[PDB]
Amino acid sequence: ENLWVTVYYGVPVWKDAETTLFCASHNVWATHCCVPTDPNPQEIVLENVTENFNMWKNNMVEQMHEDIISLWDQSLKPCVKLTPLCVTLNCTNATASNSSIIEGMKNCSFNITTELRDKREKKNALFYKLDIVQLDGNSSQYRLINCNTSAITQACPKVSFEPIPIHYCAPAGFAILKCNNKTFTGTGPCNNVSTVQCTHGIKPVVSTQLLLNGSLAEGEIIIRSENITDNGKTILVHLNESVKIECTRPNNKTRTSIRIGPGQAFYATGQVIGDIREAYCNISESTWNETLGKVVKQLRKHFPHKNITFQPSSGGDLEVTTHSFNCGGEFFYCNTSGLFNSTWDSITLPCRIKQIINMWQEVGRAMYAPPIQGNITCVSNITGLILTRDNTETFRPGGGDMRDNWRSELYKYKVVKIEPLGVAPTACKRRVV
Amino acid sequence: XXXXXXXXXXXXXXXXXXXXXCXXXXXXXXXXXXXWXXXXXXXXXXXXXXXXXXXXXXXXXXXXXXXXXXXXXXXXXXXXXXXXXXXXXXXXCXXXXXXXXXXXXXXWXXXXXXXXXX
């Protein structure tokens, strides 16, 4: 009956909000993310704070995606265009030394101009079968796969595009809330929430089917889905133990080049020496089976039906049917049908090599991966799986949107806006002089 | 100009502090000064009082301490009272304007009907 309105400023409250985060620390992200990180990052535990977090509705995922695409293109743009190489190619079977046929590669010749406008020369290069298509008649007249619809740009050899961890940081007036518990599993209230200024450092790793080089779950295997009982949703399985996968290219190249402008050399495969297999990956067998069995035990808590079946992917092109890796700048497309394919010392997956890539499943452009000299061996950590569901329970190592590869790292963070003003009742009325 | 006019006062035997006021069509609050004159029956007048647009008033010696040379910015009226014995004066109001280093009570109101009695 005698309370008065009091105005306060500096009130510790916030609202859900969407803003632009900045990226904090010739590598692509090292160059772009020029803002240094905090040498001693702070974290403030908010005692007695419950916050409703929501994966799949979290716009940071979308923001990370858009900045990655823009940066990717900013780095690729000031490089050599391959337009003059679209001319019809005269192709034969590339020679596999003593075996004599390199299944999967063609030896092509073409008439291309050089650094001078008035000079055209016949040049040779080796190409992968996956990127070469016939014009007609089953004649040896071939086109590069993307000269039919879009520009192809060769990546500059100086740019590795290697993922480095990057940190997303709030602008003044904003804060990032982080979810703890470690049983969060998707959406809803999270207790024991802490406040940070920047994320922990996420590498922008690009893969399909399996999730590589992410964080491991602290607790048991976590199966996350917007709606685990519905189909049409990506199921992200986050493992608490990694599976080591070793992938190699058991041969090496000799690189050659063609000037196709004032400098602007085009790099192309000259010769291939080594094993006939283009590539393969080593997955320990016992590790894989234990890991998959543990995943199933957790699936059974959502899926009471016995005999869960895992099958190979159903179809589409390599961006969805095979596992994608970027090792040293080389692009591997690995066949995972040797995995899954069961009901509930190593496994070798054959792998294909591709060079003209419409990365990000874009349709208006493609990048050409220059050849890498020397042999390639990479070891990665499988930290999770991407599954698609469906009479009985069936899952497949399907593909998904790129955003799904970042949700697995960003699920624990939320952005809120600070709102310093508010009111409350008080016992005392303003005194007026 | 402001058609200032008293609408007050009567004859009285006691000096008391009878109140009277003159209203006007002017932005009195906008630095006009108020003035009152002891518009006496014969012998012209004595000053009665003065006040600022902001009050901070001062009485003429005839009333001296026994005065209330009040005015209200909100009323746009020189509503005031004073003793100075049962003075035989009508009590006239005026407004004064300032000029650098000078002032004049150029605007005069119709006088009030004050008078002495008994």
């Binding site: 105005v7 500096g10 510790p12 916030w14 900045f22 908010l46 003044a172 409350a424 009325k429 | -």
Partner: protein, 124 residues
Amino acid sequence: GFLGAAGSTMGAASMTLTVQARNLLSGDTHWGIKQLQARVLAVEHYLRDQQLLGIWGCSGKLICTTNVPWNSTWSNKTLSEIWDNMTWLQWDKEISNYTQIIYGLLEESQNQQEKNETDNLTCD
């Protein structure tokens, strides 16, 4: 450090106002615009809060009282156990309703006070 008292009741959280007041102000043609827009907006938000405190007559204060009574329909909770037994987040939700009304009342109250100070122009 920042929001440390956010989950606490409005005792300590009614004191760390200097903590929250600060850091509302921070310490190539593509990203350059994104960053200028972000910086300009941080400034605009800061200023809108200051302009609002200005119109309510609370400029320069962290804690300010007024001449607007509490209605009790907004909230009929007692003073005891409102400040000491509730957090600001809970309170913000409890009285999300009538926010615009409160702000309108605060502006009206100050406008009337300004008119009274304007007419009573005390000077020498």
